[PDB]
Swiss-Prot record, chains A, B:
Keywords: Acetylation, Lyase, Tetrahydrobiopterin biosynthesis. GO terms for molecular function: 4-alpha-hydroxytetrahydrobiopterin dehydratase activity; identical protein binding; phenylalanine 4-monooxygenase activity. The chain holds residues 37 to 134 of 136 of the full protein. It catalyses: (4aS,6R)-4a-hydroxy-L-erythro-5,6,7,8-tetrahydrobiopterin = (6R)-L-erythro-6,7-dihydrobiopterin + H2O. The gene is Pcbd2. The keyword Thylakoid does not apply. This is Pterin-4-alpha-carbinolamine dehydratase 2. Homotetramer. Interacts with DYRK1B. Involved in tetrahydrobiopterin biosynthesis. Seems to both prevent the formation of 7-pterins and accelerate the formation of quinonoid-BH2. Regulates the dimerization of homeodomain protein HNF-1-alpha and enhances its transcriptional activity. GO terms for biological process: tetrahydrobiopterin biosynthetic process. It comes from Mus musculus (Mouse). The modification N6-acetyllysine is found at K84, K88, K95. The modification N6-succinyllysine is found at K84, K88, K95. One of its GO terms (cellular component) is mitochondrion.
Amino acid sequence: DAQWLTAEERDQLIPGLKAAGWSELSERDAIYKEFSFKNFNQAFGFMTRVALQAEKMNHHPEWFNVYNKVQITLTSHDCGGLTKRDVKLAQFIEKAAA
Amino acid sequence: DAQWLTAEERDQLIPGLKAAGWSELSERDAIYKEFSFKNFNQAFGFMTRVALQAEKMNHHPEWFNVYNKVQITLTSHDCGGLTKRDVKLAQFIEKAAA
Amino acid sequence: DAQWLTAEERDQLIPGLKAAGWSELSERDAIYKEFSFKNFNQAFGFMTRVALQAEKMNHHPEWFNVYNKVQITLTSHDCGGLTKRDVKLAQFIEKAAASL
Amino acid sequence: DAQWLTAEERDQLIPGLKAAGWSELSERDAIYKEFSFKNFNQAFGFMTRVALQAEKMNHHPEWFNVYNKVQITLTSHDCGGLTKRDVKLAQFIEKAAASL
């Protein structure tokens, strides 16, 4: 889905991500989460899984990494807000991190 | 360790790998295992973790992949047999696959 | 395309791949090429680019790697032969191997 | 090397990195450069090569990526400044970005 999340969609989809540790940013319609792995080997393997999914979906994260930490911000730059693509990528990221 | 595994070392280290599904090849002093993941995303993330470890250890697998399957053969080409490096890489691979 | 290459498509698409060093396997309707890099760092970086494309196009290689060598066989298992998807993937692989 | 670069080492090693486009950060004893690629496929392939080297040398970058852009900051957190390990990693990164 490429359109902005509606109010109903947000209520359906975002609370589960928040329970998983995602937060909504104050300055942007975007979601954010920092992941902490044991080490860089785990973190980068995880990033690779996310990168593969990003190319599958043609939807890419904004992310920062140092060693075992990966900070991920998701939003859809083509419409300047959250879409179902961001939700789907977040849900995949949760699977990959597990 | 870069020297061939001694008989005692083999008895100490190989049975655990065999219990995990590794086998010894008939034609070469090498160990082998096929891993089966859900899909290529999982398989390639796993390969990436192994690749990182391979560069950390300077010790590389012989491996075949198609989609969700990864076949790995470990042996030390510099001395033409199994060494502790092969055991350590196999043990890491077991962690990464889990 | 999910159907086997026609005779016409083979005459149009394969010569360029052969010129680039791919061969048609004797026992399978598949194409094959080995790539050699300076080391594993380069070889695996290349494999990662191919892996990303494989997920983008939902079409996957058969491949073997040992250190700096990557042997790639392309064919479509869902129909048991060579399709336009295999040609497209080969063309990407050529770009990646040449660092384009 | 795990100790901060000496004055002499800085005069010998940094100019080449500056010539290659690295800057020394104002607020940290660290070097910084942004790399731009054609797309994410290329950018992430490059990141994978850097990741492999990071594990080889047990020394890791700080980096940010969005699509085709990769921003890299190098510094050694174990001592809180720039070391020979950072210079070595930068030199590898230059090779990787140039497809060498």
